Design a protein around this nucleic acid. Sequence first.
RNA 1: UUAGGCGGCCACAGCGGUGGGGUUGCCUCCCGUACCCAUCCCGAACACGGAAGAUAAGCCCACCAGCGUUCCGGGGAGUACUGGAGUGCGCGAGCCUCUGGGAAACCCGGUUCGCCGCCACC
RNA 2: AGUGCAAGAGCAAAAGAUAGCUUGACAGUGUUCUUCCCAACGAGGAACGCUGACGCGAAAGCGUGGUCUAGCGAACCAAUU
RNA 3: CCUGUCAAACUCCAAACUUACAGACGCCGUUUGACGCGGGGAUUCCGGUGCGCGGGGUA
Lengths: 140, 154, 95, 186, 156
Amino acid sequence: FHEMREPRIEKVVVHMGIGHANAEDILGEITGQMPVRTKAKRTVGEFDIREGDPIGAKVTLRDEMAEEFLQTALPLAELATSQFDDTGNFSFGLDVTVNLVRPGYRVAKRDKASRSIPTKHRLNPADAVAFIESTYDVEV
Amino acid sequence: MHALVQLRGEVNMHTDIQDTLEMLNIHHVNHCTLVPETDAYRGMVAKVNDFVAFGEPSQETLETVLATRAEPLEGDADVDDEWVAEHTDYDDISGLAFALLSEETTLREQGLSPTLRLHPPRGGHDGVKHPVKEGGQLGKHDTEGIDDLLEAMR
Amino acid sequence: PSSNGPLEGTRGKLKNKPRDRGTSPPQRAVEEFDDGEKVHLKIDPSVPNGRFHPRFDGQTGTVEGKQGDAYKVDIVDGGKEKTIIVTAAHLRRQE
Amino acid sequence: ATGPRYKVPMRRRREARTDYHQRLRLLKSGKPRLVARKSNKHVRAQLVTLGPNGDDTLASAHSSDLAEYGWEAPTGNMPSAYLTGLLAGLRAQEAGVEEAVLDIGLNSPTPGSKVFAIQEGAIDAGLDIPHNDDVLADWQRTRGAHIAEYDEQLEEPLYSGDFDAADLPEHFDELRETLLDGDIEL
Amino acid sequence: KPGAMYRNSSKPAYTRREYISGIPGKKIAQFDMGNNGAGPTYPAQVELVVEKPVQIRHNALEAARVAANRYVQNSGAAANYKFRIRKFPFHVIRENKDGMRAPFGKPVGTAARVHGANHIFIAWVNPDPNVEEAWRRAKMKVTPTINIDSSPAGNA
RNA sequence: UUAGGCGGCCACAGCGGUGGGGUUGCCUCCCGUACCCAUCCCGAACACGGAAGAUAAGCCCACCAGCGUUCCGGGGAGUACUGGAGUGCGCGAGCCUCUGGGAAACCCGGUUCGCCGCCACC
RNA sequence: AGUGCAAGAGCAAAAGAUAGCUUGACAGUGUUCUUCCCAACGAGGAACGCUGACGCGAAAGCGUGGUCUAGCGAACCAAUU
RNA sequence: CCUGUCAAACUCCAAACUUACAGACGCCGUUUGACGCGGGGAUUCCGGUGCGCGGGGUA
Ligand SMILES: [Cl-]
Ligand SMILES: [Cl-]
Ligand SMILES: [Mg+2]
Ligand SMILES: [Mg+2]
Ligand SMILES: [Mg+2]
Ligand SMILES: [Mg+2]
Ligand SMILES: [Mg+2]
Ligand SMILES: [Mg+2]
Ligand SMILES: [Mg+2]
Ligand SMILES: [Mg+2]
Ligand SMILES: [Mg+2]
Ligand code: NA
Ligand code: NA
Ligand code: NA
Ligand code: NA
Ligand code: NA
Ligand code: NA
């Protein structure tokens, strides 16, 4: 049963929501791989009328690249609880989000015969805290 | 098998009704024809239900009427037993009458005019403004009902 | 009518019941008919192409040759004879 | 689901199996289709036609029943796919089938992929299929050379026991050679 | 203007406000009278039943409703009863006020369409039918002849 | 069809939920990036290569009706509406009788948790 | 939601969004429907072909302008290929 | 949750009925030649009323 039910990290998105950049450089080092531009939608008063336009960058770290980052990210954070997803995720911080899920997620992310993951097989806020808490730190 | 008799005139009656009457070989008031009970024929007498008087006649009456108002596809000839015998598959009026009623043959099939040109009802009918159930002479009749009318117009 | 365009008064006939909405199955858009076959004309609201004038919706014509992938169906409008260029998607076998 | 007015996709779209828009375009040629399908461990090649109650498969080949002719290596690889393509191709010929169009299902038209492999095989088998040579693999990768060289950076066998240690793109030749003459079910 | 001008149901239904503008407001003050705080927990329930399909101008409704409720003050401003006029003046009405040229009229009011036998008014009362009198005064101001009907009440 | 591929009808098949199933035909998750191929950044996906592990997802199998949907009994209802007819009624609006058709809402009880085709396969 | 604009209608592995590439809004000639139900009538419009030249795609295939129904004009004279 | 009402430019429903094609019966046509085709000559393009269904209008 378990082993195929026990949590794991799938991507750690680190984005810098600026309003217009030179910031990419730091993101590249703090993680280790090129950033991506963040165009925006809708015309707004914050002199942000431009639809297609660079207004920040993000980086989606997978596997080791994610751990080796969190192994310093997490330390710089305190928070826990309430600040967790109903799906077992959590965003802290510059932002750094951690997407968490169990082993058979590809079923939902592949092309052929894809399927939504059942509510039972989904990760709960609680089941999430435990997994991470159990890896160099404390909850609440 | 039902006995049809037009009781109302052509003036003002829908065309499609009048044509139906005509396909049923009736072209004049008081003219009567004999129609088999089939879906196709039922639809037609229903459409015609309001200007006619129909119903299943008694063997006897059919016989009276056949004898009195039947005619050869052409000519004056009186359709009497002999005529029937010497011209039709049957031996006498009654044998023909029975065949018609049991819908085994038709007037045409036996060389006779599809139309029984009846005479005005002696004593007058019950009116052409109301159906039977309303004291009128229109619509479907009881066998005793059809007989009375037919015999009155014998 | 207030206007005389082809789609005048076709709100009903060229509209789908909510559930029959969205792209139709290909199986009937590929159906093959032979010259001689009686077919019923009915535009598929989902299928843009291969249409015919809305006025013929409801006709039952006879397939007589084709033009391109499109079929040529002969019908009789009122008492007039006409040839209708329609694709399978908008046709059905009679009987 | 929600209401009377709610629109539920076609079953085969719910399952995310059949791309109908792509199916219409295919069917347009009016020819038989060369269904090229894969699995983590195998590869299947069907020759489907259009029928009254649903498609009709006239000829087929599974990478599994490939061993039935002397295949002793994996079946979820380049050479594997090709031969199955060719194998289905031949049974196709036998069937009296001469031409078809390549349906690759929800797969990607990536160059040198196994589905083009399947096509390349069904083509050589005698089937006439609209195609484009430079979207096919360079033969060598079809024989399984890429895998032989990958086992050159050995230190540990690429094949858990299986057959051989340095693998055999030649075993490939041997088999193709075989299918190109006589034998049962072809 | 006279009721004779709009009392019949001979025009099509004209109720779409999305295509009509300048609709006079309804003179009808309230549709729930008496103790609306409580629910139909009364022994007796009489109803004013209209006897012929007609159109009833919000003018008539208000005048018919006031006359009865205003009268139902034989029971006290905060008496124990609940009065209800279940119809609302939906049908918009016009007038052609040029002669017959471009005569589609201009919205002048609204009227509620009542079919014969529907109950336009419903009152709830304990064995204290002063209501039966409040209605002899109500169908006194509406076009149709009416039937004052009693439902739950075998306390005769 | 002890798990597959292509489909037709396109919810009777949707939504939600329970139980069961794999040293193997198998499908998957899964493991892994030298290649073909790939991410405006990530072998996530795509593509390729592969079996250390797993039946927890998916999937297949058996089942539940609470919602959505399909059809049926009984009631509503031969009611509403209506094709044909009337020297029937009504001040009139309109109604009635005869004849041929005939509903919707809703309630109560059943049904429905897909059916079928081709191919492949202990 | 979006799809340029009235209103009604179509569209979700798209008919919408992004990216890239491209100019088929190509030359020629037809069939049919419409304009004008039925039922004659021009310009115009549309759908569906064919010939020729192209664009894109692995390919089936899609492109006879913009999802569909408005955005159009005889002879005479002029200018232009 | 409870409770009170509507729609020519609403529709989860849904008639009667109108209508395309086919078969059956009926009627009609093959010396009264129908169905159809070609051509000569018109007249006609002020209509009205009853009933049913309407739209406008206090009527
Ligand atoms: Cl057309
Ligand atoms: Cl596949
Ligand atoms: Mg004679
Ligand atoms: Mg006398
Ligand atoms: Mg009399
Ligand atoms: Mg309409
Ligand atoms: Mg399980
Ligand atoms: Mg177009
Ligand atoms: Mg001039
Ligand atoms: Mg010029
Ligand atoms: Mg009509
Ligand atoms: Na559709
Ligand atoms: Na004037
Ligand atoms: Na009164
Ligand atoms: Na960019
Ligand atoms: Na499983
Ligand atoms: Na033209």
